[PDB]
Amino acid sequence: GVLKIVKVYLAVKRRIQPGDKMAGRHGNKGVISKINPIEDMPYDENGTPV
Amino acid sequence: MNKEILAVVEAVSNEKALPREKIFEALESALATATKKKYEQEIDVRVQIDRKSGDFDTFRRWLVVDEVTQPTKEITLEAARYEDESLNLGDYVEDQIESVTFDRITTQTAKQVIVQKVREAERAMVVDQFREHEGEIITGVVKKVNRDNISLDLGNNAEAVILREDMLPRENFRPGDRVRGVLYSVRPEARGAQLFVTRSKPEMLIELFRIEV
Amino acid sequence: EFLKPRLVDIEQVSSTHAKVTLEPLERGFGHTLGNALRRILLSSMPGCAVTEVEIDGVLHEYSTKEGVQEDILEILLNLKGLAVRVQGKDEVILTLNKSGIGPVTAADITHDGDVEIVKPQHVICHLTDENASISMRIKVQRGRGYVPASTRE
Amino acid sequence: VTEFLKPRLVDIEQVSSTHAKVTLEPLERGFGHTLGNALRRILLSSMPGCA
Amino acid sequence: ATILAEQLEAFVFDPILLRPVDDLELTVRSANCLKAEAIHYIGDLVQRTEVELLKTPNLGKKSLTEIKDVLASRGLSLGMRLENWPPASIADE
Amino acid sequence: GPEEITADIPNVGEAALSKLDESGIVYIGAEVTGGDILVGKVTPKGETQLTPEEKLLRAIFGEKASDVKDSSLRVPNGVSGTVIDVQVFTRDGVEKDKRA
Amino acid sequence: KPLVGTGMERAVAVDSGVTAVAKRGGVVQYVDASRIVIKVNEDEMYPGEAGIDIYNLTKYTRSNQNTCINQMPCVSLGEPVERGDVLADGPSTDLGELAL
């Protein structure tokens, strides 16, 4: 007792935000807590921010 | 010409003395409103009232003017030169038609809009009823208690609003009590004629003593 | 009576980057003006990046076009990295037409009378057939900072 | 593109005349640190005076 | 603030009417009725009154509906008159 | 009776139905928000109540009872997206509509 | 890619089934985001059933965990490929390695 089935595929693009879980490959987990600007990052005596 | 509206015209329990034909137009535009959203504007209250027909097809209009305001209802004499100057200045000559808004669907929304149109007609009727008296020394019974306002219920399904500014300071009224005064509002009020009485004016007790002696 | 900084030498050592020079400064003002101007230059400078793309035979950005070995999403990333200067407008619409086997470089855009591409060797995508051609419209506008798609079709 | 949010100091909530607490709002994102650091290094490092 | 500021003093016309009638939102025959008098911009269509447009058989029945439909947006066909083309904001610069 | 997938839907206007085609199913490529309509489907009405004005539309639209209520199956929100692929499967015997 | 791997990435990538491993080596003839055509070398080739292989890649489709199992072609045109070699990278792969 069904006439027709309509299936629709939504394609969300989820970026990153404070609250996602990132982790390395050794057990160092962590909730990313603040997405800083570029300027606040500790840079070295070449210029590149970490 | 199914003649359903013919017998639907003569129901006529509550709209006998009320304008029958106007209620058909009302219900017809209400069948045309409900799920319309495209077209060009909306619908048209104006419609060739053909008593015989019953289901008057909503016709549009062109309104002959000498001006350029209301774009879908604008003619001139130079545009009337194509009709060989048959149009005169100021006429409401109709030159267009409209249809309906449907089915299963759209008709309890049409029932809903039919109800809306009936309500508007009822409001007009109530305004006429309150204009018949135009303020008198009538009584009433309180039913609801609003902020700085007292709702009263009279006869023939009639309600009156008592202002707290036109009331006594200490003398406080509540529901279940019966008060009497002279109203002074039956013309422009709000969606009809909000019966606004004033039980504090002198003329209020003018026939109060006359009722006794 | 503080000594005032004046620009002295602008060494354009390569085409991208340069070394401006401020002289003289009293002691303490070096790190102050350095950190201050660094933080202003990284924070908010008027750039000229891209906002909208309309490839011709493409409905949504997750599709694929017949005859180009990259997806439409990769074409959008390669156009996101486009380095372009505009001169006398708020926004501008660039037009791209290319047909034939090989790359679609950034120098194949029909340039207007004020838009100037600064790196014409930039690859966008690779056409890979004899009759298979892309034809897109690109929208490039001024702005400040980072304005993503989710805030603002 | 050049017209930012430009602040004005909303209050000077002060204790006795040689001490104060001056606020500033609204500043564009990331400019609180650069004005605090610029004014801090100028006041704390190089002011004219006598002692 | 005075010290830090002194250390930086060495550093620091209706548009749819002028638009074409072919640029209108309606179909191209609506503009082509105006183009029958070689009028391509809606300002020149505004330069004559709508009644003066009605004095030509180049306008048809649906064309008048298109005329009112375009003129409903308060952009064109309001009975305008200019010297030839330009008002004050249509100045050379 | 059976249900309807067509876009002639009560209680909705232009702002919902602009993102559907002429047969209910959303387009391929229409970037939707959280809580729009993807497939229009109408049958939810059960049996509520009526009044004198509800019986006034009886003989004027060829509707003996004209149902009793209507609400095109509209979806939720919380997620954005872009409709990339639509499948329509039809049990054999049923009329294929224009999009199938 | 992993800058610091263990060399075990190619076994996990090729010996799974997300990449499009070449069956018979040869010369690529037509690369596209949809398909990849290999022309089989003559020292690997059957006498009958003349034979140039077509790899239909799996574009954007739903996985079980609501990720996006894509395949991207990683070979150029006119490029030689050997038997037992990656042609199309899969999800979280790069040039036949394993980039999580």
XYZ file of N, CA and C in Angstrom, chain E:
279
model
N 47.684 59.873 23.417
C 47.094 59.907 22.085
C 47.652 61.037 21.240
N 48.002 62.167 21.856
C 48.609 63.252 21.097
C 50.001 62.870 20.606
N 50.778 62.162 21.434
C 52.103 61.701 21.013
C 51.994 60.702 19.865
N 51.075 59.746 19.981
C 50.952 58.739 18.932
C 50.362 59.320 17.649
N 49.522 60.348 17.747
C 49.020 60.974 16.532
C 50.067 61.863 15.880
N 50.904 62.539 16.670
C 51.998 63.312 16.092
C 53.095 62.433 15.511
N 53.168 61.165 15.907
C 54.081 60.229 15.263
C 53.505 59.577 14.014
N 52.374 60.054 13.498
C 51.831 59.515 12.259
C 51.438 60.589 11.254
N 51.813 61.842 11.469
C 51.403 62.884 10.537
C 52.260 62.942 9.284
N 53.271 62.094 9.159
C 54.068 62.026 7.945
C 53.646 60.886 7.035
N 52.565 60.188 7.377
C 52.022 59.106 6.573
C 50.688 59.481 5.949
N 49.736 59.898 6.771
C 48.359 60.083 6.353
C 48.176 61.319 5.486
N 17.972 61.929 -12.011
C 18.186 60.972 -13.087
C 17.494 59.656 -12.771
N 16.340 59.436 -13.388
C 15.646 58.164 -13.289
C 16.471 57.074 -13.966
N 16.881 56.034 -13.238
C 17.823 55.068 -13.829
C 17.170 54.070 -14.769
N 15.903 53.717 -14.540
C 15.220 52.823 -15.468
C 14.807 53.574 -16.726
N 14.580 54.888 -16.618
C 14.215 55.688 -17.782
C 15.394 55.845 -18.731
N 16.589 56.059 -18.179
C 17.796 56.089 -18.997
C 18.193 54.688 -19.440
N 17.740 53.670 -18.714
C 17.947 52.300 -19.149
C 17.075 52.009 -20.366
N 17.418 50.997 -21.158
C 16.660 50.733 -22.388
C 15.273 50.184 -22.087
N 14.350 50.374 -23.035
C 13.054 49.704 -22.951
C 13.219 48.198 -23.105
N 14.259 47.757 -23.821
C 14.551 46.329 -23.907
C 15.071 45.776 -22.584
N 15.538 46.650 -21.690
C 15.942 46.246 -20.347
C 14.761 46.056 -19.394
N 13.525 46.281 -19.849
C 12.340 46.112 -19.006
C 12.106 44.654 -18.623
N 11.338 44.455 -17.547
C 11.074 43.114 -17.038
C 10.098 42.322 -17.902
N 9.264 42.991 -18.697
C 8.286 42.298 -19.528
C 8.933 41.733 -20.795
N 8.111 41.081 -21.615
C 8.584 40.540 -22.883
C 8.904 41.663 -23.873
N 9.640 41.296 -24.928
C 10.281 42.278 -25.806
C 9.290 42.966 -26.740
N 8.102 42.387 -26.934
C 7.101 43.016 -27.796
C 6.549 44.287 -27.160
N 6.509 44.321 -25.823
C 6.089 45.512 -25.087
C 7.017 46.689 -25.365
N 8.329 46.432 -25.378
C 9.295 47.454 -25.765
C 9.271 47.705 -27.263
N 8.930 46.685 -28.054
C 8.939 46.816 -29.509
C 7.814 47.726 -29.992
N 6.719 47.792 -29.235
C 5.669 48.767 -29.519
C 6.200 50.198 -29.409
N 7.037 50.461 -28.402
C 7.703 51.760 -28.308
C 8.777 51.904 -29.380
N 9.409 50.789 -29.752
C 10.453 50.808 -30.772
C 9.882 51.003 -32.171
N 8.564 50.852 -32.320
C 7.896 51.216 -33.566
C 8.007 52.708 -33.878
N 8.167 53.555 -32.860
C 8.560 54.943 -33.057
C 10.052 55.157 -32.829
N 10.856 54.088 -32.960
C 12.323 54.083 -32.801
C 12.763 54.551 -31.411
N 11.954 54.254 -30.396
C 12.238 54.637 -29.019
C 12.750 53.411 -28.285
N 13.992 53.477 -27.828
C 14.625 52.349 -27.170
C 14.784 52.525 -25.672
N 14.797 53.756 -25.166
C 14.949 54.038 -23.744
C 13.629 54.555 -23.183
N 13.329 54.178 -21.935
C 12.029 54.470 -21.325
C 11.856 55.952 -21.006
N 12.957 56.705 -20.941
C 12.842 58.148 -20.771
C 12.194 58.826 -21.961
N 12.577 58.407 -23.171
C 11.944 58.929 -24.377
C 10.488 58.491 -24.477
N 10.169 57.306 -23.951
C 8.778 56.876 -23.856
C 8.015 57.730 -22.854
N 8.710 58.201 -21.818
C 8.104 59.099 -20.848
C 7.967 60.511 -21.400
N 8.770 60.865 -22.414
C 8.790 62.227 -22.950
C 7.462 62.595 -23.609
N 6.771 61.610 -24.167
C 5.396 61.770 -24.606
C 4.480 61.198 -23.535
N 3.265 61.734 -23.446
C 2.270 61.200 -22.528
C 1.740 59.863 -23.036
N 1.121 59.103 -22.125
C 0.600 57.782 -22.473
C -0.579 57.870 -23.438
N -1.362 58.952 -23.348
C -2.454 59.191 -24.295
C -1.898 59.416 -25.697
N -0.765 60.128 -25.784
C -0.075 60.308 -27.059
C 0.483 58.993 -27.588
N 0.816 58.059 -26.699
C 1.158 56.719 -27.150
C -0.081 55.970 -27.635
N -1.239 56.243 -27.023
C -2.493 55.610 -27.425
C -3.007 56.102 -28.773
N -2.470 57.201 -29.297
C -2.859 57.727 -30.598
C -2.121 57.062 -31.761
N -1.553 55.868 -31.555
C -0.852 55.134 -32.595
C -1.335 53.690 -32.656
N -1.578 53.155 -33.857
C -2.033 51.759 -33.949
C -0.916 50.749 -33.791
N 0.333 51.201 -33.641
C 1.434 50.302 -33.313
C 1.261 49.654 -31.941
N 0.505 50.282 -31.043
C 0.122 49.664 -29.783
C -1.127 48.806 -29.973
N -1.063 47.573 -29.470
C -2.164 46.629 -29.537
C -2.881 46.453 -28.214
N -3.722 45.419 -28.112
C -4.530 45.223 -26.910
C -3.692 44.756 -25.724
N -2.838 43.754 -25.931
C -1.970 43.291 -24.852
C -0.866 44.299 -24.567
N -0.536 45.136 -25.556
C 0.513 46.137 -25.379
C 0.098 47.211 -24.377
N -1.193 47.561 -24.343
C -1.682 48.522 -23.356
C -1.651 47.940 -21.943
N -1.979 46.651 -21.814
C -1.844 45.956 -20.538
C -0.388 45.910 -20.094
N 0.525 45.697 -21.045
C 1.953 45.740 -20.746
C 2.395 47.141 -20.341
N 1.774 48.164 -20.935
C 2.097 49.557 -20.628
C 1.723 49.886 -19.190
N 0.492 49.542 -18.803
C 0.053 49.750 -17.425
C 0.845 48.888 -16.447
N 1.216 47.672 -16.863
C 1.983 46.776 -16.001
C 3.388 47.311 -15.732
N 4.019 47.918 -16.740
C 5.330 48.530 -16.529
C 5.196 49.835 -15.754
N 4.140 50.609 -16.030
C 3.990 51.929 -15.421
C 3.458 51.852 -14.000
N 2.989 50.677 -13.578
C 2.548 50.507 -12.200
C 3.702 50.628 -11.210
N 4.928 50.323 -11.646
C 6.100 50.354 -10.776
C 6.636 51.756 -10.516
N 5.917 52.806 -10.929
C 6.245 54.219 -10.737
C 7.564 54.618 -11.383
N 8.012 53.881 -12.395
C 9.253 54.202 -13.063
C 9.080 54.879 -14.402
N 8.001 54.564 -15.119
C 7.831 55.040 -16.483
C 6.371 55.360 -16.754
N 6.150 56.094 -17.852
C 4.829 56.429 -18.400
C 3.965 57.234 -17.428
N 4.585 58.102 -16.634
C 3.861 58.990 -15.738
C 3.586 60.355 -16.360
N 3.649 60.463 -17.686
C 3.403 61.728 -18.365
C 4.510 62.751 -18.218
N 5.747 62.370 -18.515
C 6.894 63.223 -18.257
C 7.179 64.152 -19.437
N 8.079 65.102 -19.197
C 8.503 66.072 -20.200
C 9.874 66.597 -19.814
N 10.836 66.461 -20.714
C 12.170 67.011 -20.541
C 12.463 67.952 -21.700
N 13.621 68.619 -21.654
C 14.000 69.488 -22.764
C 14.335 68.688 -24.018
N 15.438 67.934 -24.023
C 15.498 66.844 -24.987
C 15.726 65.482 -24.338
N 16.957 65.213 -23.888
C 17.242 64.046 -23.062
C 17.346 64.342 -21.569
N 18.246 65.244 -21.189
C 18.862 65.182 -19.850
C 18.184 66.092 -18.842
N 17.883 65.578 -17.652
C 17.632 66.457 -16.504
C 18.932 66.905 -15.849
N 18.807 67.356 -14.594
C 19.961 67.898 -13.871
C 20.965 66.828 -13.457
N 20.493 65.667 -13.004
C 21.405 64.613 -12.566
C 21.908 63.800 -13.756
N 21.331 64.044 -14.935
C 21.803 63.419 -16.168
C 22.918 64.244 -16.803
N 23.486 65.191 -16.046
C 24.607 66.043 -16.438
C 25.818 65.266 -16.933
N 26.703 65.970 -17.653
C 27.752 65.334 -18.455
C 28.733 64.532 -17.606
N 28.914 64.917 -16.349
C 29.829 64.209 -15.476
C 29.066 63.252 -14.570
